[PDB]
Every structure is written in C-alpha cells, then in structure tokens.
A = this chain, B = another copy of it.
Amino acid sequence: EALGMVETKGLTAAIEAADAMVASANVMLVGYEKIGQGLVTVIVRGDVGAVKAATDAGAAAARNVGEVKAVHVIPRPHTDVEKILPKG
C-alpha cells in the first residue's frame, strides 16, 4: 500500500540501497530515477510496515557505501499507487 524512497549521491550507494531494501523486507523495487548532480532515487513498493523496514535497511546500506541525501515513506491509496511517480 505504501511507497518508499532512498535518495543517494552516487549510483553505487543506490544499487546497494536497492539490494538491501529487497533483501530485508517484502518490498518490490519500482526503479531508479536520475535527477543529475550525482543524485539517484531508489523507489520501492509494498506494505507500510515492510516499506518502513526496507527504507531503513536501504538508508543504512547506502550510508555504508556513500552519501544518503533523503529517506522517506509515503503511505498511498490502493486505487492509484504508482500514479504520483515521475515519467522521467
């Protein structure tokens, strides 16, 4: 039901965050978003609780590799969940 995000400065940290997120909780990786200036956002989906767990492990994983710029969990409607996400 919720959306989880880990924004890092560096792709290596983002890949590590992504891997940790999916390994730790029952979340599905939505994808990556590059906005420039080394900023990469990793987006995940699933239960709010599992998203909170995932985002936490992903934030930790990336801090061990590089710089974490933002960490957020967005509870979302079951009707139009991935609606709010960008189209690049």
On A, residues with C-beta under 8 Å from B are 3, 5, 7, 9-16, 18-19, 22-23, 29, 31-41, 65-66, 69-72, 74, 76-79, 83-87
Most B-side CB within 10 Å, residue of A5, A10, A11, A69? A11
B70 lies within 8 A of A19 (CB): no
Q: Do most interface residues of chain A lie in helix, strand or loop, or is the interface mixed?
A: mixed
State the 4 A-B residue pairs at the shortest beta-carbon distance, nearest first.
A12-B70, A36-B36, A37-B38, A32-B86
As for how many copies of this chain the complex holds, the number is 6
Residues on B with C-beta less than 8 A from A11 are 5, 7, 33, 35, 39, 41, 86
B72 lies within 8 A of A16 (CB): yes
B83 lies within 8 A of A15 (CB): no
Chain B residue, CB-CB nearest to A87? B31
Chain B residue, CB-CB nearest to A64? B72
